[PDB]
Every structure is written in C-alpha cells, then in structure tokens.
Chain A
C-alpha cells in the first residue's frame, strides 16, 4: 500500500491515506504531507465525516479500492496486526494505540480498505478503535466508542 505520512517539526504525528480518486487526511493532526504533489491540493475542512479533496491528476489514480457492502465479521488486515470485528473494532493488544498513529487504513484480505482509525488510545485490557466506515448502503458513517480520546 501507499500511505504518505504527515511531518511536523521533524516527527511523524499522523498518516494520510489515498483511496481511488480521493486523498484522505485526519483533521486532528496539523502538518504538511511529504508528497509535494499532494501539498498543492486544496484540502477543505468539513464535518466529522472527514471530507477532503482528490484533486490529483490522471497518472496515479485508483491506488486502492474502498471495500463495498456485505461485510462479514471474520478476519481483516491491519498494519500492526489483525482485527476481527465488523460492528465494532477488535480488542487489539498494546504497542498499537499510542500517539501519532492516526489515519492508518484497515484493509481486507483482497487489499481493500474498510476503515480509517481516528481514536481510542487505551480502554483497559480491551482497546476499542474509533473508525469511520459505511453502514449498509455505502453512506459514510462514523462509529465512536465511549471514552475515545484522539489517537
């Protein structure tokens, strides 16, 4: 996958994901993307649904495909491990869930992105992730568990 991070004062505090046609970036992080082609894009602020602008030209579109409907609750891919929940997100162990790990996509077994993490630092022995997804008909929803600090 291709996921350009976000630089601020030398450290990495967020990640920017690219889906087919559009470029994603979390609102909670501040900084400049390392891709100079992506810096000229006029990203616009929006509501909690995290709408940005895919103003990239034709030569590199459709990097990955967003996952469609008919979601099973089985195995799913993740950068730091695996998640196995559809209605919620899985209770992943420690290590993942620190700081500056926002914007990392959650992929399927065919390489299709299903969700993008935004929060849920630590909730005890079981950590829940606050992600965005599509509920039933492709309409973008935002699911947030209780006590989900911005992560």
Chain B
C-alpha cells in the first residue's frame, strides 16, 4: 500500500452522525433530569419562606 491507515479511516459521514446522536441522546436526558432535580429544590426552599 502506498498510503497509510489511520484510526478514523473507515468512519463515514452517515456513521459519524449516528455516534453523535446517541452521545447527544444521553446528554439530553441527563441534563433534563438534573435541571428538574434542582428546580423542585428551589420551590421546596421557597415553600418555607
């Protein structure tokens, strides 16, 4: 072979979109509940006074 092989040689554009959606699917659900966990703690702090 005249060329050289790298780590990202076989990764296509359609395959790179799947691993950036599945990574983004977990990051969307994690920050949805993490915001909502601190939202009700603000109401529970504001409920007393």
* Alpha-carbon separation in the docked complex, A135 to B47 (Å): 8
Per the CB 8 Å criterion, the residue count for chain A at the interface is 5
Per the CB 8 Å criterion, the residue count for chain B at the interface is 3
Interface residues of B in 17-49 (CB under 8 A from A): 47-49
Closest chain A residue to B48 by CB distance?
A: A141
B interface secondary structure, majority: helix
A139 at the interface (CB under 8 A from B): yes
Closest chain B residue to A134 by CB distance?
A: B47
- Which A residues touch B48, using CB under 8 A? 135, 141-143
Q: Quote the shortest CB–CB distance from A145 to chain B (angstroms).
A: 13
Q: Quote the shortest CB–CB distance from A60 to chain B (angstroms).
A: 32
Contact with B along A134-151 (1 / 0, CB 8 A): 010001011100000000
